[PDB]
Design a protein around this ligand. Sequence first.
Ligand SMILES: C=C(C)[C@@H]1CC[C@]2(C(=O)O)CC[C@]3(C)[C@H](CC[C@@H]4[C@@]5(C)CC[C@H](OC(=O)CC(C)(C)C(=O)O)C(C)(C)[C@@H]5CC[C@]43C)[C@@H]12
Lengths: 220, 220, 220, 220, 220
Amino acid sequence: HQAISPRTLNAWVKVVEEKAFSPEVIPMFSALSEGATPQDLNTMLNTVGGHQAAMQMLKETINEEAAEWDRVHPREPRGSDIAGTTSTLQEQIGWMTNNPPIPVGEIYKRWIILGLNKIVRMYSPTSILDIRQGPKEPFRDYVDRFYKTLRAEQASQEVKNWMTETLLVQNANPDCKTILKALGPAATLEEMMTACQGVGGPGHKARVLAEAMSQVINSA
Amino acid sequence: HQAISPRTLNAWVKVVEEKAFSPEVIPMFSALSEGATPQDLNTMLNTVGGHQAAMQMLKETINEEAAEWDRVHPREPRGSDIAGTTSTLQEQIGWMTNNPPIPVGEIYKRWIILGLNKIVRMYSPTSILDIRQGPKEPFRDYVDRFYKTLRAEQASQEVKNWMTETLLVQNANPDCKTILKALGPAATLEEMMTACQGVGGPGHKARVLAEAMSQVINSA
Amino acid sequence: HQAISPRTLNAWVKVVEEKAFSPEVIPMFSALSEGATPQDLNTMLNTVGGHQAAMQMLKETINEEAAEWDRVHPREPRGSDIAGTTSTLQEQIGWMTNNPPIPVGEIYKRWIILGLNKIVRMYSPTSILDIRQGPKEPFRDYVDRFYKTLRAEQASQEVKNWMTETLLVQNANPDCKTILKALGPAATLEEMMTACQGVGGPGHKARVLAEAMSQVINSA
Amino acid sequence: HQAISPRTLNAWVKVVEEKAFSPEVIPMFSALSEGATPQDLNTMLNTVGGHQAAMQMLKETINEEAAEWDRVHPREPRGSDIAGTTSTLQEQIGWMTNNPPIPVGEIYKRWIILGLNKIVRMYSPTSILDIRQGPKEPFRDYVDRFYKTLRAEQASQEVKNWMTETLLVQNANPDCKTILKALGPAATLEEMMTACQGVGGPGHKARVLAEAMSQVINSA
Amino acid sequence: HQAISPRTLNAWVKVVEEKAFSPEVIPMFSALSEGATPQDLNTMLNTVGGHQAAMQMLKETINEEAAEWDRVHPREPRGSDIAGTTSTLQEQIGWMTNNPPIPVGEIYKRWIILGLNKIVRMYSPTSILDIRQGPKEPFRDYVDRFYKTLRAEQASQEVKNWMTETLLVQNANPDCKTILKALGPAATLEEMMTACQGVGGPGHKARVLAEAMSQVINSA
Ligand SMILES: C=C(C)[C@@H]1CC[C@]2(C(=O)O)CC[C@]3(C)[C@H](CC[C@@H]4[C@@]5(C)CC[C@H](OC(=O)CC(C)(C)C(=O)O)C(C)(C)[C@@H]5CC[C@]43C)[C@@H]12
């Protein structure tokens, strides 16, 4: 048999990790899995890195599809057999080669396509550019979330360092941003966190309130 | 057979604690665990202390690889048998030294290497130096977290006391920092907490607002 | 036979592309591919996407090692047979399971390790951060190089758009930088290229020389 | 045998010409060639007009895929047999209709999809809108490049004349653009080339430098 | 038979690496390889790392000597047999132990000595001390050449870093040297490259010409 070659599987993983879950991944999946066995489709789906929530919804949709097949359809393959959960590779090969054919691979591909369509319909891909500090969020938690996303980000080490240099100070709230810009660019992460530790405390609130009242009093 | 030695295990634990989960763990592990029965691998993994979340991820990854082996591969070892959970030492050695050999230890090493690579990729070590105080965080909760982290980390007692003296006051927000500096160095922990209890309350906030207003009025 | 797994190969590709050719590539290759046939090693080598020059030198190093093996060593494996070029999986499996065994996979792995060590020794990765306009380079050639590198760069589309927004004007030469800065942030790529189309022509050089001489005369 | 109809082939050529090597050609290629004999796939690939570099890229990718097939897989078809080079239509039809079937057409389609995906990943189309004069390029070579691109462009004669009237003067460098604008709309191509013959010569540089210094002196 | 020991081969490699291709290479090669078979001589020749051009000339000289031997002379050894390309170790041992002996190793050593003498005659080794920036060379190209030579240079990492901080700015052209000196020792490679990116452009030319003319006018 001609299963999924490593090149095809790696191209699938690359296209998924490059285009996230955009609609354009739906055609690519169908093209790279023509004639694929249900076990081959399961291997195709199981090698996706990240996107745990999307894979969870895809598995849930596959489960609903299998339940629907079990309800409508009373050896004869079942929903789990088509999905490959309880089915040997030899059984699938026999099913797709027996006369008359039972395209278990085609049915599984249809179910996976339905799940992919739903995901693409309501997905929302996170990114390092979408990590910004809240109006009242502490700077330490902002740095924690930013670095977690950066570690989850897909880029080279130098590009990640450039992201750290730029977006960390770019995407902070004005209260922390004014303090951060009041410091020199040479300031490292520890100094920035120490400077922004005070933001939100009673002392910082009193200081900003006093500055505002002094400015408005001097204006009038 | 020749199983793992106490010095081998001690060196493994020592490097794990020293480098936490630095990438150098990946080679060094493969410099000790090679040629070992998967039971020795399980002992190697379980002997470690701390990093419970990382060990949970590592176990989860081995579970995923065992499920993958059970799916692709239909006595012949199963995924749990290779993982060592449901395989005894005798049949384990028999599998290792069979004709043809079934490298159960090699496959378990590959799974553990995959899990360690994931951990190295997305895990950030926690240290006492990273424990600071939030802008609204009460001082008592800060001290509790500080002491919990201090007890968690390994060091000699003299270094622990030096850290307590030099870091607890230093890694505090300006509101607590001002009160702490206004107190004498001879002040103990109970005195420090008592003097810092009022921070964040109504009286302290009113007092700081009063100083800010007085400074503004005196300036102009 | 238990050949390589899709997850292991995916992880190998992931580490190769994430770390480029950092030294950390050598241990991981020694962990994922340890115990594999020469065909599996060839698959892992050929599957790696990008870095055409580095894979070329790896092929040259493997060829040199095979030639040395042929020169020293007079069915008995040859250099090409060990490298997998002129051998089948059945022949290799028989070789590593013969009495006495002939570790063809081990020798091929050693050759690949030597090649990877040489690459890590003298290979310098390229990145979009290293694309800077020359002092005499036309702006359009710089833009073409920048966009080619961006297309070759491993990043998400949003990150690539951010790179286009920032680095393209950030890495331009001062003569083009002045014009781009005077253009304003709202300028598009076509307008930016039109504005810098004359940098280096007789008119621009005459203008800048006249400005410099006017500054000198006004100073005097 | 139901081969590829002329309408399907011409539609494939039309979408390739109109959409270029945009992503939307992967879905279209799969839809029009679903069930195609490898000879039919080669006919679709060869009929594409233009895009010599991209077609060569696809040929190299198909060659690498055939080499991979030959390496992994020991009448039994070979890589060139799947690619359709060393195989007749009768042999491929018999392979498709054999028991068990050998989907050589599906494998060739997968290889072509892989090559198309790589091309779409890194291809960049060229158009007459991208033909601009360099800051030091002589006007005549710019006109030659512009007319070569215009001849290679797919458009009507009147549209091509309109772009000749507009873009040729629009996309010239500032030094030539000033002269062309001062010439007049009535000026033909020969007069335009004659007026821009001196751009870059000693006389033109002396003239522009003199004008710049005269402006500077008059300003002072 | 007593072949060449690893210590002798390592000493030969160290001598070549530390003396480059000084005349003292000839005596040491005559002392370490005295009595070696052509296979051992080929091992020492091919093992030498670096100096690709020198080894190419040595191979060319060996080929010329082999051609001369084939022309002058009518199993009976041949030129390639003396060079070890065609002959095996058993044949070489038989020739050296035949009555009368045929010292093919001695002839091959003479050919290698002739090649080494030619190399020592006309070979000039490159060093990081000879990497100087051209009068019109861009700074980034000079940096690339310097770093490639440094990577090829035999030294420790700390010494290489010291070379980076000293020679890179020490061996820059005066136009770039002035800007680098005006920057300061605190500047890193990125800031230095950004500052020197404008050297050799209309703005920099206008600036330096204006400075010189202002100096002349002030002097007058
Ligand atoms: C301010 C002054 C004190 C004096 C008072 C008035 C003045 C005079 O009466 O003397 C009018 C003439 C000028 C403006 C000088 C200043 C200097 C200049 C200059 C020397 C400037 C540098 C320029 O050099 C290049 O452009 C050379 C190169 C780049 C290689 C190229 O060929 O393009 C050239 C073109 C050679 C000019 C010639 C015109 C003069 C003499 C003025």
